RNA sequence: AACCGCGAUCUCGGUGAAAUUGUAGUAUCGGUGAAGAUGCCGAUUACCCGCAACGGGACGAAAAGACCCCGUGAACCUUU
RNA sequence: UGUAGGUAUAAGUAACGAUAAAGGGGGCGAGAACCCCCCUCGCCGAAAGACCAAGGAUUCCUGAUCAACGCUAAUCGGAUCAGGGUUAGUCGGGGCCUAAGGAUAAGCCGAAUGGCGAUCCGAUGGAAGAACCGGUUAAUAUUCCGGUACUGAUA
RNA sequence: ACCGUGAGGGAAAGGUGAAAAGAACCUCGAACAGAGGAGUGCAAUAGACCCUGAACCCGUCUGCCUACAAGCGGUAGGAGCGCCAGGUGUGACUGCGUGCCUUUUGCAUAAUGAACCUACGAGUUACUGUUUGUGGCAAGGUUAAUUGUU
RNA sequence: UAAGGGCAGACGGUGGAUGCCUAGGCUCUCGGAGGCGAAGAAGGACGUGAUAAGCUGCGAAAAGCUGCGGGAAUCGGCACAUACGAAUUGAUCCGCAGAUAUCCGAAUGGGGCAACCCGUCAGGCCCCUGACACAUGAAUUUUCAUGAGCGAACGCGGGGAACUGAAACAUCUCAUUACCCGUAGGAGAAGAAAACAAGUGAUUCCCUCAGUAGUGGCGAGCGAACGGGGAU
């Protein structure tokens, strides 16, 4: 229930080894020329798989 | 005269460093360090895309900081950066001052709450 | 001189645009209706019909210094809505 | 759950007010001690 | 305490960056013992646009112990004393030449 | 005993405590020993770092044992 | 098991306070699960609706602000700053009267300080003279405006 | 201030610069939120929490080591690599090694005690005795209260 | 291969140690003074500024009014301010003397939950206002002076503990202390022998006599006076 000892800096950092921020899955627009999330509508131009989806 | 000479030397050194700073951001330094470690060393435009689409909250502020650092590079070089020419050469997150608050606990006890802040520094340089 | 200052506000403007024989003063908190009436007759040479009064305590305010904060108060006052006889203005 | 403090202004002024302190010799002793310490509030009659 | 200089006098700066320069006293700040001398100790103040702004050049006060009354005989920035020459009224006179200061 | 529903639980985004804490790169068995050993001896086993889950040990945490004795200590109660 | 201040560890862990419940479309905005408007859904309904009193004391309305506060964010707020807002002859209270009790007079008691002791004070009780229908503010209304009245003094 | 019905208890908190000259204007950004410049200034790593700016605690970079290894974490040996001319960083591998305080006949003890750092924290003074080191006078030694001149 | 980790150096962050500084304390010396108040105190409430007042000052004459003396160019208090004015015909400022001085408070016209409510009588205005008076006790003869309340220490007086020490405890001690109460003055108290002594000559204070004479479960402890030298 209670820690018998305080943890050292080394022990704490060893546990935190596996803490990381996930990289987003980014695809390039071959025509538009910008970044967007793969399998997601490109919000700059509204196109998805070569077809207009969201009309600005 | 000694302090004047030292200040002149430091000012001359500053002219060849391209950096921006964010100070006193009211947000956990340990949480900001995740994003910093994610984007350390990346090409600048790819890093801008990563920060734009990241699922962490701190990326919104880091994106503005990186844009400001790129603008400082452009001003100190008196030109514009070409595509794929700059990269994130240095980035660190430091702990800042903490706000202390009290939250009531059962049976009359009271506990301290720490609202932490952070500083971020970004350098940019050419892929040499 | 119990009368301190006239009341210029949206409510007073609306009531004067409606009735035109009604005027609002801010006076000392201890002056009753008879003395408010005699005072406005002296100060404006008009005949007064009726007086309505209400007491306001001062607002509590926060004076800000370099180090911290102090708690202060505004002065109390008395409102006096004054109805003149039909025919006269101020 | 009923707690110990149940406010009543009449009771407060009857128990701890300036006139009740001035009524007895020991109340005047309390007032003299508070004046000697220099308290900004002397009785519960001061608070508003 | 009455001062050794007054507004409308001509003084000389005996110490500081403006050492050896004479000017006219414009205003005296008695509480902090400083005076404004015309044309001396110029400062560039940055002012935001208010009642266009800009960079205004202005005069900054000088401590009065750095100012001495100019002798009206050679302009040598003497010391002064006080005497009762003018019909017994106290007046200021220069010590280097003995002439009164008017 | 089986199955079912929601809340807690688990994963992700935001905020973010506490008790505890000599330092720790903190394995097992037998022996030894202030006489029941993570830390000594001799062997045995064991690539580095997490997450979920359970409570055998750390004579685990908490409260300077209330039981027992002691102090020319204290209080209260009774009485020829 | 020493004191003050600062910073750690456990740990990005416990928890975010009733299992009445939410979905969508528009608006404003740099930024929206949460703010504003609309439609649909759900909960209370001898209440979780509407009033009087105690207690609180500007929290009420409006314009700016989102630093701190709000257990998330916030363009929102019972938050910050400024301005505004409470109107009575008839409503309530007090002015009048006494209860318990309290302070006292004449007197009594008592090292002192003081303790008793029938007129006064003292509501939680008694007396109170006396309307209304319609409008009207961002915020007050039996109080303001228009109609119908009543009640007490005074010449 | 805060706490308590009340009597009462009772904090924390000083320092820009000689002079506000307290940063016009530009850039990124919704915004000074913040920063990078420009300018002022001896100095802005003196920029409003502002002199100096330590430790615990938290980061980044560079050098060396580290994924077959087992106990107070050091100590004595000792290759290799790496820096600035005999110094310095790291350290493969080997030997030895159960913290410290207190309390006890005896504690690695599974007896007590401490999260850590900075700061604070415990044989003092007066009088009277007595012994002694060093001195002044010496069959004598010494003044107390107080009084004069300054 | 270093996912991570260890050590060192450099540079940062946080935090606010240290060094330097300060009129804010502490302890005293010398000289004064030793009270304020019914002609209304101490201490408060509410007001008062060109702009809200948090302090300061002042009181409806309200950061202020008048006279005399000093003095000579700025001034209009402070919390990093502008405006607008005053001032050599002498402002502001300093010394002395005056004027005004709301409400509560001994509070004193009666009440009351302090800073409020309600009155009477004489006038003056005009249901309501501003200005008078209206308490009680003691000398006193209804005319008159005096008192009440507050407040540092020092003085005198009336009551008066316990823990503690005696290695328990009761006589004793702590101690005629703490504390409560009453009451003066610049000091108070004492003071001019029905005295000490075995000759001195009123009180008071200092140095000695002296830890002596005594006293005491003769335990723990307590503890003089005569005489001598001084201040006066
Ligand atoms: K009316
Ligand atoms: K009214
Ligand atoms: K000088
Ligand atoms: K302990
Ligand atoms: K708004
Ligand atoms: K400096
Ligand atoms: K300095
Ligand atoms: K530092
Ligand atoms: K070793
Ligand atoms: K034990
Ligand atoms: K006497
Ligand atoms: Mg993890
Ligand atoms: Mg935060
Ligand atoms: Mg997100
Ligand atoms: Mg509670
Ligand atoms: Mg407010
Ligand atoms: Mg869990
Ligand atoms: Mg989470
Ligand atoms: Mg064994
Ligand atoms: Mg074992
Ligand atoms: Mg152990
Ligand atoms: Mg245990
Ligand atoms: Mg024990
Ligand atoms: Mg403990
Ligand atoms: Mg855990
Ligand atoms: Mg909980
Ligand atoms: Mg949970
Ligand atoms: Mg109320
Ligand atoms: Mg509201
Ligand atoms: Mg928030
Ligand atoms: Mg509001
Ligand atoms: Mg009666
Ligand atoms: Mg009643
Ligand atoms: Mg309403
Ligand atoms: Mg903002
Ligand atoms: Mg420096
Ligand atoms: Mg510094
Ligand atoms: Mg092997
Ligand atoms: Mg290996
Ligand atoms: Mg033993
Ligand atoms: Mg041993
Ligand atoms: Mg023990
Ligand atoms: Mg321990
Ligand atoms: Mg131990
Ligand atoms: Mg310690
Ligand atoms: Mg450092
Ligand atoms: Mg007058
Ligand atoms: Mg004069
Ligand atoms: Mg009376
Ligand atoms: Mg005893
Ligand atoms: Na469990
Ligand atoms: Na590493
Ligand atoms: Na009275
Ligand atoms: Zn595309």
Curated annotation (Swiss-Prot), chain A:
Q: Which cysteines are joined by disulfide bonds?
A: none
Which keywords, in A-to-Z order, does the entry hold? Ribonucleoprotein, Ribosomal protein
Q: Per the record, which residues fall in region Disordered? A: 1-19
Choose any GO biological process term that the UniProt entry carries and state it: translation
User: SUPFAM superfamilies of this UniProt entry?
Assistant: Zn-binding ribosomal proteins (SSF57829)
Keyword flag Transcription: no
Q: Which Pfam families match?
A: Ribosomal_L32p (PF01783)
Provide any one GO MF term from the record: structural constituent of ribosome
Q: Which InterPro entries match?
A: Ribosomal_bL32, Ribosomal_bL32_bact, Ribosomal_zn-bd
Basic residues bias located where? 1-18
Record flagged with keyword Ribonucleoprotein: yes
* Recorded GO CC terms: large ribosomal subunit
Q: Do you know which HAMAP family this protein is assigned to?
A: Ribosomal_bL32
What NCBIfam families has UniProt attached to this entry?
rpmF_bact (TIGR01031)
Q: Which family does it belong to?
A: Belongs to the bacterial ribosomal protein bL32 family.
Q: What is this protein called?
A: Large ribosomal subunit protein bL32
- Please report the organism this UniProt entry assigns to the protein: Porphyromonas gingivalis (strain ATCC 33277 / DSM 20709 / CIP 103683 / JCM 12257 / NCTC 11834 / 2561)
Curated annotation (Swiss-Prot), chain B:
Q: Which Pfam families match?
A: Ribosomal_L22 (PF00237)
Record's keyword terms, sorted: Ribonucleoprotein, Ribosomal protein, RNA-binding, rRNA-binding
UniProt xrefs under Gene3D superfamilies: Ribosomal protein L22/L17 (3.90.470.10)
Q: Which GO terms describe its biological process?
A: translation
CDD domains in the record: Ribosomal_L22
Report the GO terms under cellular component: cytosolic large ribosomal subunit
| GO MF, one annotated term | structural constituent of ribosome
Q: How does it assemble?
A: Part of the 50S ribosomal subunit.
Q: NCBIfam families, per this entry?
A: rplV_bact
Q: Which family does the UniProt entry place this protein in?
A: Belongs to the universal ribosomal protein uL22 family.
Question: What does this chain do?
Answer: This protein binds specifically to 23S rRNA; its binding is stimulated by other ribosomal proteins, e.g. L4, L17, and L20. It is important during the early stages of 50S assembly. It makes multiple contacts with different domains of the 23S rRNA in the assembled 50S subunit and ribosome.
HAMAP family for this protein: Ribosomal_uL22_B
Q: What is the name listed in the Swiss-Prot or TrEMBL entry for this protein?
A: Large ribosomal subunit protein uL22
State the organism named in the record: Porphyromonas gingivalis (strain ATCC 33277 / DSM 20709 / CIP 103683 / JCM 12257 / NCTC 11834 / 2561)
Swiss-Prot record, chain D:
Q: Which InterPro entries match?
A: Ribosomal_bL34, Ribosomal_bL34_CS
Q: Which family does it belong to?
A: Belongs to the bacterial ribosomal protein bL34 family.
What is the protein name stated in its UniProt record? Answer: Large ribosomal subunit protein bL34
Q: Name one Pfam family in it.
A: Ribosomal_L34
Q: Name one GO molecular function term.
A: structural constituent of ribosome
Write down the superkingdom of origin: Bacteria
Q: Does the keyword Ribonucleoprotein apply?
A: yes
Q: Name one GO biological process term.
A: translation
From Swiss-Prot, chain E:
**What SMART domains does UniProt report for this protein, alphabetically?**
KOW
Entry keyword Glycoprotein: no
Quote the SUPFAM superfamilies the UniProt record gives.
Translation proteins SH3-like domain
Q: Which domain of life is it from?
A: Bacteria
Q: What biological processes does GO assign it?
A: translation
| Keyword rRNA-binding attached | yes
Q: Choose one Gene Ontology CC annotation of this protein and give it.
A: ribonucleoprotein complex
InterPro entries, A to Z? KOW (IPR005824), Rib_uL2_dom2 (IPR014722), Ribosomal_uL24 (IPR003256), Ribosomal_uL24_CS (IPR005825), Ribosomal_uL24_KOW (IPR041988), Translation_prot_SH3-like_sf (IPR008991)
What CDD domains is this protein classified in? KOW_RPL26 (cd06089)
Query: Which GO molecular function annotation, any one, does this entry have?
Result: structural constituent of ribosome
Which keywords fit this entry according to its UniProt record? Ribonucleoprotein, Ribosomal protein, RNA-binding, rRNA-binding
Q: What does this protein do?
A: One of two assembly initiator proteins, it binds directly to the 5'-end of the 23S rRNA, where it nucleates assembly of the 50S subunit. One of the proteins that surrounds the polypeptide exit tunnel on the outside of the subunit.
Report the PANTHER family cross-referenced here. MITOCHONDRIAL RIBOSOMAL PROTEIN L24
Oligomeric state and interaction partners are given as: Part of the 50S ribosomal subunit.
Q: Which family does it belong to?
A: Belongs to the universal ribosomal protein uL24 family.
Task: Please state what the protein is called.
Answer: Large ribosomal subunit protein uL24
Organism from which the protein derives: Porphyromonas gingivalis (strain ATCC 33277 / DSM 20709 / CIP 103683 / JCM 12257 / NCTC 11834 / 2561)
Its taxonomic placement starts with:
Bacteria, Pseudomonadati, Bacteroidota, Bacteroidia, Bacteroidales
Which gene is this protein's source?
Answer: rplX
């Amino acid at each position: 229930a209670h820690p018998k000892r305080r943890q050292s800096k080394t022990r704490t950092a060893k546990r935190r080894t596996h803490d990381k921020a996930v990289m987003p899955t980014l695809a390039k627009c071959p025509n538009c020329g910008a970044w967007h999330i793969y399998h997601t509508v490109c919000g700059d131009c509204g196109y998805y798989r070569g077809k207009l989806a969201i009309e600005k | 005269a000694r302090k004047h000479n030292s200040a002149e030397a430091r000012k001359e050194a500053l002219k060849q460093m391209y950096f921006a700073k964010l100070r006193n951001v009211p947000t956990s330094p340990r949480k900001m360090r995740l994003v910093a470690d994610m984007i350390r060393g990346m090409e600048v435009n790819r890093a801008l895309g990563v920060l734009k689409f990241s699922n962490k909250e701190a990326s919104a502020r880091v994106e503005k900081l990186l844009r400001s650092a790129v603008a400082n590079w452009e001003e100190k070089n008196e030109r514009k950066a070409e595509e794929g020419e700059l990269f994130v050469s240095r980035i660190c997150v430091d702990g800042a001052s903490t706000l202390k608050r009290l939250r009531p606990a059962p049976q009359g006890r009271g506990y301290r709450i720490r609202k932490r802040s952070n500083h971020v520094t970004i350098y940019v340089d050419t892929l040499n | 001189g119990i009368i301190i200052k006239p009341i210029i506000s949206e409510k007073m403007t609306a009531v004067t645009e409606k009735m035109s024989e009604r005027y609002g003063f801010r006076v000392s908190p201890n002056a009753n209706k008879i003395e408010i009436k005699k005072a406005v007759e002296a100060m404006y040479n008009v005949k007064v019909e009726d007086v309505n009064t209400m007491r306001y305590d001062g607002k509590r305010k926060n004076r800000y210094t370099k180090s911290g904060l102090i708690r202060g108060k505004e002065a109390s006052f008395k409102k006096a809505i004054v109805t003149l006889k039909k025919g006269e203005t101020i | 759950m009923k707690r110990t403090y149940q406010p009543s202004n009449r009771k407060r002024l009857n128990k701890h007010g300036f006139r009740s302190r001035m009524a007895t010799a020991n109340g005047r002793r309390v007032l003299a001690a508070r004046r000697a310490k220099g308290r900004a509030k002397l009785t519960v009659s001061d608070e508003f | 305490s009455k001062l050794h200089i007054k507004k409308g006098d001509t003084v000389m700066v005996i110490s500081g960056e403006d050492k050896g320069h004479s000017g006219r006293v414009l205003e005296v700040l008695v509480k902090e013992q400083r005076a404004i001398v015309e044309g001396l100790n110029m400062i560039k103040k940055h002012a935001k646009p208010s009642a266009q702004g800009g960079i205004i050049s202005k005069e900054a006060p000088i401590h009065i112990s750095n100012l001495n009354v100019v002798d009206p005989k050679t302009g040598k920035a003497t010391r002064i004393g006080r005497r009762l020459n003018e019909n017994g009224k106290l007046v200021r006179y220069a010590k280097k030449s003995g002439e009164e200061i008017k």
